[PDB]
Design a protein around this ligand. Structure first.
Ligand SMILES: COc1cc2[nH]c(C(=O)N3C[C@@H](Cn4cnc(N)c5ncnc4-5)c4c3cc(O)c3[nH]c(C(=O)N5CCc6c5c(O)c(OC)c5[nH]c(C(=O)SC)cc65)cc43)cc2cc1O
Length: 226
DNA sequence: CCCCAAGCCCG
DNA sequence: CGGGCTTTGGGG
């Protein structure tokens, strides 16, 4: 175990709050143990360890993240994503398999909704020619979190949205009965409707979607149509 | 500060 | 199903 990770584990554990850990763990449907440390203090505790030990060398970067990913309490995956932000400008196409592995390990919406729109979205914005090397596999996978990755990687693209691709992806997954797929479709359409509401409205009025997906997509624009 | 973004519950 | 309410988190 890297010294940075041991120090972070000791420091988090010394500030654990079992009273808060119970509702925090219930909120994530008891997929994970929690220490009970909410985000403001969790980020201060991480800042303390970086100040003392310095940020790990880039050569250890994936190893540090993997070690944190393997620890039981969910705050360690959250801190791992905070650490990944510190290397953001260096994340590139060679890291897609590493991000895939993070998506399919200790999976839930909290980690995936951080990994995908920020880290993957930025990679594919610079390297759109790589989208077709990953997105078809992700849609076909049995893994709902990779399917959600295919939906959400363009979430914050605004005028760089590839509309044909977005609608093709949604069409491939529109029959899913999985809540997290139906809701991801609703989210990405709702978000894109902040940039181009007319196209989203016409899409949902003319293509099949789960009721949840349609409702979530138009809940902030429907008052402007009809 | 603001406004944006799962779980629960009832109709 | 629709959607109002809750809490904390994301980002300006
Ligand atoms: C790419 O772009 C984006 C990515 C994003 N990720 C998130 C996100 O990851 N969220 C938002 C928000 C979860 N969340 C909360 N409220 C809403 N109204 C939401 N709507 C959607 N999600 C929502 C949330 C996370 C992640 C987490 O890891 C979270 N953890 C908790 C949590 O832990 N909660 C929420 C419920 C809750 C706690 C908590 O700490 C508590 O302290 C123990 C709590 N106590 C109680 C009670 O005694 S009831 C009186 C409830 C309660 C909330 C939470 C927002 C977001 C925004 C973006 O634009």
């Amino acid at each position: 175990m890297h010294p940075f990770v041991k120090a972070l584990q000791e420091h988090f554990t010394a500030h654990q709050n079992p009273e808060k850990a119970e509702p925090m763990a219930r909120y994530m449907k008891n997929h994970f143990l929690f220490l009970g440390i909410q985000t403001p203090e969790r980020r201060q505790l991480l800042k303390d360890i970086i100040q003392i030990h310095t940020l790990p060398d880039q050569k250890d970067f994936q190893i540090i993240i993997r070690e944190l990913w393997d620890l039981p309490e969910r705050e360690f995956q959250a801190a791992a994503l905070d650490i990944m932000q510190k290397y953001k400008k260096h994340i590139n196409e060679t890291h897609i398999p590493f991000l895939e592995e993070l998506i399919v390990t200790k999976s839930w919406w909290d980690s995936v909704d951080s990994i995908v729109p920020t880290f993957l979205g930025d990679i594919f914005l610079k390297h759109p020619e790589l989208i077709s090397a990953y997105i078809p596999k992700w849609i076909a996978s049995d893994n709902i979190w990779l399917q959600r990755a295919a939906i959400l990687f363009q979430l914050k693209y605004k005028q760089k949205m590839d509309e044909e691709l977005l609608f093709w992806i949604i069409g491939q997954l529109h029959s899913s009965k999985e809540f997290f797929i139906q809701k991801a479709i609703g989210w990405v359409l709702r978000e894109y409707a902040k940039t181009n509401p007319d196209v989203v409205w016409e899409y949902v009025q003319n293509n099949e979607l789960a009721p949840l997906s349609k409702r979530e997509a138009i809940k902030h624009i429907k008052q402007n149509y009809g």
